[PDB]
Amino acid sequence: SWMESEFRVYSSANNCTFEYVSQPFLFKNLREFVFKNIDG
Amino acid sequence: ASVYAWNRKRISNCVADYSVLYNSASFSTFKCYGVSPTKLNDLCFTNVYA
Numbered sequence: 001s002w003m004e005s006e007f008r009v010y011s012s013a014n015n016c017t018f019e020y021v022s023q024p025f026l027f028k029n030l031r032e033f034v035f036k037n038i039d040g
Numbered sequence: 041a042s043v044y045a046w047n048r049k050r051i052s053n054c055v056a057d058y059s060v061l062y063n064s065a066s067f068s069t070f071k072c073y074g075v076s077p078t079k080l081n082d083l084c085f086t087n088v089y090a
């Protein structure tokens with residue numbers, strides 16, 4: 001089996017304001033994304 | 041919780057069907073300030089705390 005740990009990304013997290021879970025966002029395959037942040 | 045050390049819950053990212061609590065017979069009192077309890081189902085807030 002395999003194990004994954006987010007503790008190598010951050011040591012801790014507090015005061016969480018938002019959470020969302022869905023399906024994965026991600027010859028060879030080319031993946032393109034656009035990230036915008038408008039009006040919150 | 042005890043009154044000197046009251047607890048808080050944060051409510052977000054949900055649909056607040058306030059009519060469920062307003063029309064409940066399990067309460068002895070229900071009073072609102074700054075808002076009417078019969079209009080709550082038509083309102084949106086940035087945060088709700090209980």
Ligand SMILES: *[C@@H]1O[C@H](CO)[C@@H](O)[C@H](O)[C@H]1NC(C)=O
Nearest residue numbers: 014015016017018050086087
């Ligand atoms: C959590 O974050 C919100 C938004 O920045 C802030 O208003 C609130 O005071 C923070 N809570 C704590 C305990 O820091």
